[PDB]
Every structure is written in C-alpha cells, then in structure tokens.
Design an enzyme around this catalytic site. Structure first.
Site, mmCIF file in Angstrom:
data_model
loop_
_atom_site.group_PDB
_atom_site.id
_atom_site.type_symbol
_atom_site.label_atom_id
_atom_site.label_comp_id
_atom_site.label_asym_id
_atom_site.label_seq_id
_atom_site.Cartn_x
_atom_site.Cartn_y
_atom_site.Cartn_z
ATOM 1 N N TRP A 103 78.964 29.801 0.501
ATOM 2 C CA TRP A 103 78.532 30.543 1.669
ATOM 3 C C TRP A 103 79.706 30.954 2.551
ATOM 4 C CZ3 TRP A 103 74.542 33.218 1.124
ATOM 5 C CH2 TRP A 103 73.466 32.731 0.392
ATOM 6 N N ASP A 173 78.547 28.511 10.746
ATOM 7 C CA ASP A 173 77.302 28.831 10.045
ATOM 8 C C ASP A 173 76.578 27.513 9.846
ATOM 9 O OD1 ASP A 173 75.224 29.515 8.278
ATOM 10 O OD2 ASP A 173 76.609 30.355 6.749
ATOM 11 N N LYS A 197 65.718 27.969 6.719
ATOM 12 C CA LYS A 197 65.993 26.728 6.049
ATOM 13 C C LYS A 197 65.346 25.610 6.790
ATOM 14 C CE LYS A 197 69.832 29.199 4.217
ATOM 15 N NZ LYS A 197 69.848 30.511 3.492
#
Lengths: 362, 361
Positions: A103, A173, A197
């Site tokens: 990511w 993040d 999430k």
C-alpha cells in the site's frame, strides 16, 4: 447461509450487527422525517445533524485536537494518494516514504506524478516482514513530509510507535487500523483512511488534517481533491456520500458505547493473541512470517508448512461459516482479517478449527 | 410519521418498493451470510451485483458494446476534471454550450486542463433557452462539445441534441439520467451522478465510447483515469458497493415498469399537470423557461406576489410537500419531479397551488 457467517474479508469487511439492524429499522423513514437517509438533501437539517454528529463522535473517539479538520470524502484512500502531494507540495518538493508493504508502494508511485519522492527504506527485500529502527532512517533535509502506511493490510505489518519527521510533518494511511486504538493525533499532520475496513461501508474516506496545512494546493488540483474547498464547505461542496457517512456515524456512536478506543484496543489485542498463539504453538504447522513486535492486530497472514493443504483448509473453513480466509497471491496461505467488529467467537472458532485441522493432517 | 412527498433536487426521492427490498436484504443479502455493505468487491456475490447492474442499465438505455459503462465515485463534479484530463491535451480546445449554472461549473474546472470556448451562453436571458443548433459557431478543431442536458437549477432541458462539427458530444445527464430513451450512438460520453434519478449519492455513471478511452494527461490521478477503470471493470480500487447495488435495484425496477419509453410517458404526464397549472394561473405563478425546452425533471416557478413565496413553501411542507424552495438567485420555488416522484405527489401540489391562488389572488 440463513445465519450470518464469520466474515474474515480484508475490505470491505464485517460490521457490527447492532449497527446493521439499526440501519435496517430506519431505512424507510429515518426518525419520522418522512424519508430514508438515502433520499435526504445534503443541505437539509436532518443530514446536517447526521454529519455533524459523526464528526463530533469521531473527534471524541480519537481525541482529535481542535486545530485539526475532519473531512468526509469520496474516492477511497487511492484518491488521497494523489490529493496529498497535490495539496501539500509544489512540483519540485520531496516527500519521504518508509515502505513497509504494497500500500505504501502504491502511494509512492502516484505521488511521482505531482512531486519528487524518496523511499528511505523498503521492506521488500525480506518480503515485508519488519519495520525499521527509526533513529537510523536518513530523512531528506528539506522533505515536506514523511509518509507511512500504519497498517499494511496485505503484509500484516503494523506500526506500534511512530517515527519523528525531521524537517516536515508525518502522514499516515491508517485505512486498515483506523479507530482500532488510541492515536496521539497531534504527532501527525495528516491521518487518512478508507472507511470500509474498520468503520463503515465503502464509499467514504476520512481525512484528519492539521488546519495550518490546508490551502495552497497546486493549480492542477481538481476542485474535488482540494482540501481547502472541502474544509471551507464542511464536506458539503458537492453531494457527499450521505448514506455512507450515516453508517460511519452509527459505528462511531457504537464504539463510544463500547467504552471508547482504549476498550476497543483491549479486545483487539485479546483476540489477535489467541490466533498468533495458536500459530506459534503449532510446532511449525502454521507459520506467520512477520516479526513479532510489529504483528498487526487487524490482518494476520499465515501459511502451512504443507502448502498443498491450504486450498482444503480454506474450503473446509468456509463450510464451517468462516469465509474469505484466502491469502494474497504473492504468498498463498491464508489471511485472517480480524477488525473491530469481528466477534471474539469467530476468532475462537478459527483457532478451534486450526487445532482440529492440525490433528487431522499432522 | 408517514412518508412525505419529497421534491428535493438531489439527493432525491427513491421508489418505495426499492427501499423496502433494500431493507429486507440489508442484514443478510440472499442468504449469503452478510450485508452488501460487508461483501468483498472481488467476491462472487458482488461481482454478480455489478455485472447485473451493468447489463440492466445497458438494456434500459440501449447502450451498445462499442461503449464502456463505468461505476465511479466522486460525483459529477469529479468528471468536470476527468473529462478534459482524459480526452484532451493541455493545448486542445473544448466547446461549451452553457444553458445553466452546472455547465458554467464544468467550464471553470476544464480551464485548468485545456482551452475552453463558450460558443453560446444563456446567461443574458437568465438561462431560459436552448440555442438554435444551426447557428452555433463551433470551433473547427474542437476535441468535444459539452452540454448539460438538463440544467437542474434553471429547468432547461435538451429535447434534440446538436451535432458536433468536429469531435464528439459529451453530456452531463445527472438530473435526467434514465428519464427517457437516448440514442447513445450520438454521444462520445454521457455522465451523471446517480443521486438525482437512479440511486443514492456516492455513485457516478460514465458511459464512454471505447475508441475514446486512453491517452490521459500524465497528471491525471489514477482514480480519474478512464483506461484504468475500464480495464479493471470499475474494480481498480474499492468501489461504492452498496451504492452500485442500489442503482442495480433501481435499474431492475425501471425495466419492470416497461423500460424508458414508459418512464418517459409517465414523466411527461405528471410534468404537464404542473406546467398546465402554472400557465392557466393567469400569471399568479410564472415559469421563466421557454416552452419547448421546459424540463420534465426540474420545474422552477415564482409568484407574481413574491412576498408570498415563504408562506407557500411553509404551508406546502405542513401538507407533507417538502424541499420546494427555489434557488437563492431567483427565489421562488423549484419542484423536482424525478422518475420516482409519485403522480399523487404532483397532483397534491397542483391542488395546493389552485387553493393557494384562490386564497391569495
């Protein structure tokens, strides 16, 4: 099945049953307003109360200081990969990155369109299993900010402590561990995450940004990526993701009812420990590649020594109502995502299933 | 605590059967064991939902295979940037026909990315007309011609479409999307936010001719890049799963209604009731828009006695007709009467208008 399953999906993911049932109850006519949240004007008094309560509840949960803004945006965390350097950098500025999984690597690649990037350290050489020691990171003397992915969703690597940026501010993040535990927000210039999430359905992304960093985006910034536009319009410049924000609001209200993020962290630690201990006590039958001190409480990758049995493990677990356990194609094996709303009983069922599996196939 | 008649311009009223289906599916969609809101976007259940939504929309609007259908986030306002980022070089020119304030916002955002020529603007007559097409002076090497097919604030709707002299036609159909048949082959791109006529906010639909996909400017964000979205079938990142599901329910229900020829008949009938009431009012109520281009979706009107506008809106809300306030610029009222507004709602407003006029004329 007719009963709900234990859903180990990594995103979108499991949500609290009480939140879902509240949404069901109110879907046709929210609080005698005479319409669904899906039908409300975003400039009307009902929706305003929802978005304001969502922001207020979030500020309480995370203990967000008054000098930060809270934005509720569309476009996912991937849109923020572009919005961050567009808002915060000039084209010849540098952003530093610590890359602990894929990511963060995607964030690097997108940022190159808009400024210069520097990857200080990458975990790639050891299959993304560690976090570096912070003191020895060579930061770029004039870097605008340092970017981390706090929880690498595929690789199971989680920051517990945070590096201190040398020249600039810290950006994280936190998509896959957002509201899993307390965070000292004041250590960051920006925290961002997709809701899907840990705190709602897909379609909502949250950006928490220090107010002194808002403004002066690059001229090529789309108006829909411009932090100042969003902030000065309180997330209502255009039509927001109303229903998604409502759903996030329900989740925040419920996390406060659970006792807030200290309590949430305790439960998350407890259930993660059952799974990591099952793995570690299996005499190598199951394996987790991640270094112990940075093992994610949210995403648990693991493999079998007898990898030929992985497909069977996954298929049989699904027959016992434990679904979406398949791991990433790079490593195979399994990934158990165990977010806030994963019941303890689901983790217990997986651990018992692992026991039985090991006994059968040793 | 009955449901109200909801005249909001976006987000907007949805079919009650669709809302009830969504309620019934919410906790556990078809015995899958989870909500749509909890599904993996790469799982088989969600894949069936998005594929069915695409098929249903292709059937409804008659969208041939030479076009891609994209389900995106960001609103129509994100498309104001994505269009020129994808379709233009920085020194290309785009022509605009501006018939209201949404087209004006599209112009402003496009200026960041390419050159713009506003070849016609309705502003000097307060956005009440559509130009004669034959008289438009189109730029000979324009990349595309942008229209807003239904100007949601101003109530101006295209009935026929101009033929681009060069390039292709792009239409913002946000507030009339799936209100009537459209010959898609006339267009290079049709786009619109779902929230007016086909779903909740958080989804934007882009219908784009396949030969126009690719070659975006290097500065285009990955999330604004049509080639990325097309090659990944709208699953490059995590899509707005629940919104797409809701759009799917709406498209299925519009097919069950008989398709867009039938939807258009119902829309024409209920709009005519309101416009006829306005024109028969001997000036008590007034619609500024030129008759041939009056929108079937958004009906702006004022009172000759402007001081009564606040009373009109307040009393209508007491009678369960809400969100009729017009735009700050011209005051008055705006009745948004999208596909899902029941005929009974328009009838009630028409009755309310007749009584109000008798009382205050």
């Amino acid at each position: 099945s007719n009963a709900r399953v234990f859903n180990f999906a990594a995103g979108p993911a499991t949500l609290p049953e009480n939140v879902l049932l509240k949404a069901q109850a109110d879907l046709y006519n929210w609080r005698g307003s005479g319409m669904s949240v899906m039908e409300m004007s975003h400039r009307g008094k009902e929706f305003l109360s929802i978005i304001q309560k969502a922001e207020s509840d979030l500020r309480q949960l995370l203990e967000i200081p008054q000098e930060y803004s809270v934005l509720f945006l569309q476009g996912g965390a991937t849109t923020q990969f572009a919005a961050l350097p567009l808002n915060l950098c000039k084209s010849d500025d540098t952003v530093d990155f610590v890359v602990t999984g894929s990511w963060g690597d995607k964030a690097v690649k997108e940022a190159k369109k808009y400024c210069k990037t520097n990857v200080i350290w990458s975990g790639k050489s050891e299959k993304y299993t560690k976090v570096p020691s912070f003191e020895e990171l060579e930061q770029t003397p004039d870097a605008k900010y340092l970017h981390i992915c706090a929880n690498e969703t595929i690789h199971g690597v989680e920051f517990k402590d945070y590096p201190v940026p040398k020249n600039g501010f810290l950006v994280a993040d936190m998509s896959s561990n957002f509201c899993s535990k307390p965070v000292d927000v004041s250590k960051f210039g920006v925290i961002y995450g997709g809701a899907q999430k840990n705190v709602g359905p897909s379609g909502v992304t949250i950006v928490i940004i220090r107010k002194d960093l808002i403004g002066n985006a690059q001229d090529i910034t789309p108006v829909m990526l411009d932090y100042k536009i969003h902030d000065e319009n309180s997330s209502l410049y255009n039509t927001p993701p109303c229903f998604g924000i409502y759903m996030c609001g329900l989740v925040f209200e419920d996390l406060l009812e659970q006792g807030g993020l200290k309590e949430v962290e305790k439960k998350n630690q407890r259930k993660a420990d059952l799974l990591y201990n099952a793995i570690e006590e299996s005499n190598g039958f199951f394996r987790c590649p991640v270094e112990k001190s940075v093992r994610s409480l949210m995403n648990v990758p693991f493999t079998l020594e007898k990898s030929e049995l992985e497909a069977e493990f996954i298929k049989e677990a699904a027959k016992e109502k434990m679904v979406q356990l398949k791991g990433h194609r790079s490593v195979g094996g399994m990934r158990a995502s165990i977010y806030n709303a994963m019941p303890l009983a689901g983790v217990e069922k997986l651990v018992a299933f692992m026991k039985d599996f090991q006994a059968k196939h040793a």
